[PDB]
Design a binder for this molecule. Structure first.
Ligand SMILES: [Mg+2]
Ligand SMILES: [Zn+2]
Lengths: 162, 72, 222, 175, 141, 96, 45, 38
RNA sequence: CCCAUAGUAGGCCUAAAAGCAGCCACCAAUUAAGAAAGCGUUCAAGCUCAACACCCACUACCUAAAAAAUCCCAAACAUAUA
């Protein structure tokens, strides 16, 4: 990889860009004819928001996302991975990819409202005060619609609004 | 009043003698090949020549100007 | 370098005299004395007239049935005549002047006592009929913009189309029809009276093929 | 900064349009006009001619004199005063290619053509284009053609210009 | 995806190749330099200051400059052409006044070039410029 | 390159860029010379000069900048990219 | 074909070898052939 | 802020942002252009 | 994401109308920039866009949602095989 290190010594700031170690691909990917890493490793429709081992290979050291021109993902898999990583961030997963901040974590907010498959940003969704009639109820989005094509073993489709 | 009026008395031979025009045999020959009346067209022009691409680009600019009247 | 392509030339298109839209009168010169019934079938189903381009290359295509009246005519004519270029574009009507008489009874009237007096006139329009056509030495984008402007204000669904656009829509409809993957078709079931479905369907559904519902047209219905 | 304008050689009065722009620039205008006029006193005609003016922080100005206008030179070689109203459909006069060669050889030493590596061919092409825009007409050889062409054209153009002037007359009457 | 249908070469790049080959064959030496993002008026000011001694300048796209460098004998010129680059086509090789008129602007780098098929760096160019007069060099032996 | 034009490059008094054109890792500092020799970034103040030191045996891109307060900011950019060192230099000049 | 790698002379360590070959051919003899050099090189000069 | 069902930038300095589950058009040059989705 | 030199303040008309008040023409230099597409200007000027040079992630599945009066309204739940 690459990094920038700044050394202040005697009113002189040395700015250096150094190259560090980098992990390569595994020796024998199963489908070398594929285009995306997901297609190459046959992971298409085979990963969820729980697969942090797969998600964290596409994300910045501070919980951010990496661009497609670097990762190599297709447009569809990029959106799938980005939404999955948002849900993983909101689910309390990825503890070491927290946003960087000098001292702002000391005023701890509301305690651990445990949650998962969180689609929207928790601080921007209004309560459902009226719920509508039986034939049109205001449902609650659970999960992401961009994972509707994942492999299903339950013989019943995944429920996205419940 | 003020408006530029310097109108030399152009007679049948005024501008043939007011300035020292040299005989036709003394000017170089490359002067008498210019396209005078109409400008030349794409089909007349060779896709290899640079003026071909200049004219094609002028047509492209005209098309862009025509189209870009309602697009913000 | 960016590769360049020749501009589409216009040396075989001649604009006619009087290029702006003709004034449309609200009522016929000879008013109709006899009052006719509301034969609602003149806006039902597909249009059989004015479905193809005649002289222009752009148009407003109706995607649903409805009645055009003088307010609509004035709106479209004024917007077109104030938004087009007389020297390079010409616009031609494709719907007649309002001729169908709509009668209404006096306000606060009980039911009965004959029909009402003729109040105004309308032009029936079916889905798939071109309403205004446009031609000249211009591309499609400017006319598409200021014609979708007009089409959004029509009493029915409408779009701004061109020759190539309309041909593309028709070819895509045929392609969808042939590559449809389920084996159960409205046409097949309706024509074979499968499940006795004609007790729910209409005699017009044998020809509408499920694509038309009242004065509404579904272009994704196959 | 720079100032782009055209002013007559022997006539530059401390007023509009150079007045307000130079006043907003912040430099004396009488000194500039007197200096310019005394520079161009060496011209025996009083030829309008463009001027590039450059200013520096210490409130003094350096001015570069160029060549006169191709519009002026072409209308002078044509012998007409005003440009044609209907360019392309109406002819403003007749000139020969020797005149445009002379104009090019006398103009190419200005700041807009001697600053580049332009042959006289591209310069005369530019002059021919500006002539077409002006509406004047250029053909190949005019030894015996020009004399008869001038003979007929002076009369027909005087008649047509009188027609245009009376056109302006009834237009000004019908208000 | 199946192999792309390759395009055919256009007249622009074809004649660009022709003229670049012509000026690489007929000329004596070439001086490449960096295309400073400098104003147009001053840019033509230098352009005229260089042409006043009868030496020309040109600018060409890299996407057509590179293949000539790769497939010709001038391969070693390629790795210098990674940015905003221009070339000075100059017959009757004269370097003294070029260096003198480039020294006024210290941000114009002469990244190098060839001198009768002899490619030298910037300091190479300066020490080649410092070479004695050609009649003296000829008469030395 | 409008970032420096808006940030007012006027604190600086001298900048110099050293590189070898015949080396593969000089593009960043070369295009930094390009963006720092721009008309606006240089016309924001006419009391500072830009220097293009050209050598062949150095084999290393480097940048050395000195401004009014006497501080010497050196960034030997051969792995460090143009935009990164650009925003670093801009941040340094706006801090001081 | 190809061209020489062409290094710099601010740190001079290498020089073209065609010069070495020609000098090894010409510069190991007495005045007998130096007279040939002097008489002959000036036929065109 | 003005409520709109369709939002469009009225100048080059208008920018669309997605905040509090809504689409806003924010302009710093002309605060006149501030629009909020409804 | 850059980049805006020129015949030229193209002529006519206009007090002035310079690409941008209205029309006719729309050539033409440099490797590149339209007798000018948006503004903007009293006229100018200062801004873009169209143009070389510079690399080039996509440069976009089109749009297609709203509030009334006593008190929301089953509880819930995305992943063990038709
Ligand atoms: Mg401007
Ligand atoms: Zn705005």
């Amino acid at each position: 990889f690459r990094e920038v290190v700044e050394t202040q010594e005697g009113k002189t700031t040395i700015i250096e860009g150094r190259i560090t170690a980098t992990p390569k691909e595994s020796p024998n990917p199963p489908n070398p004819s594929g285009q995306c890493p997901i297609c190459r490793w046959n992971l298409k429709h085979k990963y969820n928001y729980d697969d942090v081992l797969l998600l964290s290979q596409f994300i910045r050291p501070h919980g951010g996302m990496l661009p497609r021109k670097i990762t190599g993902l297709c447009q569809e898999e990029h959106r799938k991975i980005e939404e999955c990583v948002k849900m993983a961030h909101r689910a309390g997963l990825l503890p070491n990819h927290r946003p960087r901040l000098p001292e702002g974590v000391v005023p701890k907010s509301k305690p651990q409202l445990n949650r998962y498959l969180t689609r929207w940003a928790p601080g921007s969704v209004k309560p459902i005060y009226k719920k509508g009639p039986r034939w049109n109820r205001v449902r609650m989005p659970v999960g992401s619609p961009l994972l509707r094509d994942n492999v299903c073993y339950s013989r019943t489709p995944w429920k996205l609004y419940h | 009043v003020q408006l530029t009026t310097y109108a030399m008395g152009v007679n049948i031979y005024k501008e043939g003698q007011d300035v020292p025009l040299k005989p036709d045999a003394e000017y170089p020959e490359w002067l008498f090949e210019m396209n005078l009346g109409p400008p030349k067209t794409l089909e007349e022009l060779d896709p290899e020549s640079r003026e071909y691409w200049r004219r094609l680009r002028k047509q492209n600019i005209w098309r862009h100007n025509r189209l870009s009247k309602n697009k913000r | 370098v960016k590769t360049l392509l020749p501009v589409p030339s216009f040396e075989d298109v001649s604009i006619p005299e009087k290029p702006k839209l003709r004034f449309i009168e609200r009522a016929p010169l000879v008013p109709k004395v006899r009052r006719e019934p509301k034969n609602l079938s003149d806006i039902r189903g597909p249009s059989t007239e004015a479905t193809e381009f005649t002289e222009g290359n752009f148009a407003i295509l109706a995607l649903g049935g409805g009645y055009l009246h003088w307010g609509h005519f004035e709106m479209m004519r004024l917007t077109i005549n104030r938004s087009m270029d007389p020297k390079n574009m010409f616009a031609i009507w494709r719907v007649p002047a309002p001729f169908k008489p709509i009668t209404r009874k006096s306000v606060g009237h009980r039911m009965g006592g004959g029909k009402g007096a003729i109040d105004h006139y309308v032009t029936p329009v079916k889905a798939g009929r071109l309403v205004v056509e446009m031609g000249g030495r211009c591309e499609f984008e400017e006319v598409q913009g200021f014609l979708d402007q007009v089409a959004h204000k029509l009493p029915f669904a409408a779009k701004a189309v061109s020759r190539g656009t309309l041909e593309k829509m028709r070819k895509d409809q045929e392609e969808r029809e042939r590559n449809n993957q389920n084996p159960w078709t409205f046409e097949r079931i309706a024509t074979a009276n499968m499940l006795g479905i004609r007790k729910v369907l209409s005699p017009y559904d044998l020809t509408h093929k499920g694509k038309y519902w009242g004065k509404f047209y579904m272009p994704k219905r196959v | 900064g720079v100032i782009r304008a055209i002013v007559r050689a022997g006539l530059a009065m401390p007023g509009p349009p150079l007045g307000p722009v130079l006043g907003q620039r912040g430099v004396s205008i009488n000194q500039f006009c007197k200096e310019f006029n005394e520079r161009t006193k060496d011209i025996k005609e009083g030829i309008p001619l463009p001027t590039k003016i450059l200013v520096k922080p210490d409130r003094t100005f350096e001015i570069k004199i160029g060549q006169p206008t191709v519009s002026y030179f072409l209308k002078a070689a044509a012998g007409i005063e005003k440009g044609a109203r209907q360019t392309g459909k109406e002819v403003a006069g007749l000139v020969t290619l020797k005149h445009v060669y002379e104009i090019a050889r006398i103009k190419a030493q200005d700041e807009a053509f001697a600053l580049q590596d332009v042959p006289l061919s591209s310069v005369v092409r530019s002059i021919i284009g500006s002539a077409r825009s002006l509406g004047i007409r250029v053909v190949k050889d005019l030894s015996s053609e020009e004399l008869a062409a001038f003979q007929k054209e002076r009369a027909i153009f005087l008649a047509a210009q009188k027609e245009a002037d009376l056109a302006a007359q009834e237009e000004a009457a019908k208000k | 995806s199946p192999p792309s249908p390759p395009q055919e070469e256009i007249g622009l790049i074809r004649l660009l190749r022709r003229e670049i080959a012509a000026v690489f064959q007929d000329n004596r030496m070439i001086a490449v330099c960096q295309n400073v993002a400098l104003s147009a008026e001053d840019k033509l000011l230098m352009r005229h200051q260089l042409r006043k001694h009868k030496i020309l300048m040109k600018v060409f796209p890299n996407q057509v400059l590179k293949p000539f460098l790769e497939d010709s004998k001038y391969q070693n010129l390629l790795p210098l052409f990674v940015g905003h680059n221009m070339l000075l086509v100059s017959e009757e090789p004269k370097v003294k006044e070029m260096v003198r008129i480039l020294r006024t602007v210290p941000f114009l780098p002469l990244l190098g070039g060839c001198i009768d098929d002899t490619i030298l760096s910037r300091q190479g160019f300066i020490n080649y410029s410092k070479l004695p007069s050609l009649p003296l060099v000829q008469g030395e032996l | 390159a409008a970032a420096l034009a808006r940030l007012g490059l006027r604190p600086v008094k001298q900048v110099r860029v050293q590189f070898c054109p015949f080396e593969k890792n000089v593009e960043s500092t070369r295009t930094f010379l390009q963006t720092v020799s721009s008309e606006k970034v240089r016309s924001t103040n006419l009391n500072c000069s830009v220097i293009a030191d050209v050598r062949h045996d150095g084999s290393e891109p480097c940048v050395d900048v000195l401004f009014g307060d006497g501080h010497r900011l050196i960034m030997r950019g051969a792995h460090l990219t143009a935009l990164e060192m650009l925003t670093a230099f801009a941040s340094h000049i706006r801090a001081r | 074909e190809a061209l020489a790698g062409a290094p710099l002379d601010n740190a001079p360590k290498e020089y073209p070898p065609k010069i070495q070959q020609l000098v090894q051919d010409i510069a190991s003899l007495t005045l007998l052939e130096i007279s040939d050099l002097n008489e002959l090189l000036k036929k065109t000069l | 802020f003005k409520n709109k069902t369709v939002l469009k930038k009225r100048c080059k300095d208008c920018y669309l942002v997605k905040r509090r589950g809504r689409w806003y058009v924010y302009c710093k040059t002309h605060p006149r252009h501030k629009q909020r989705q409804m």
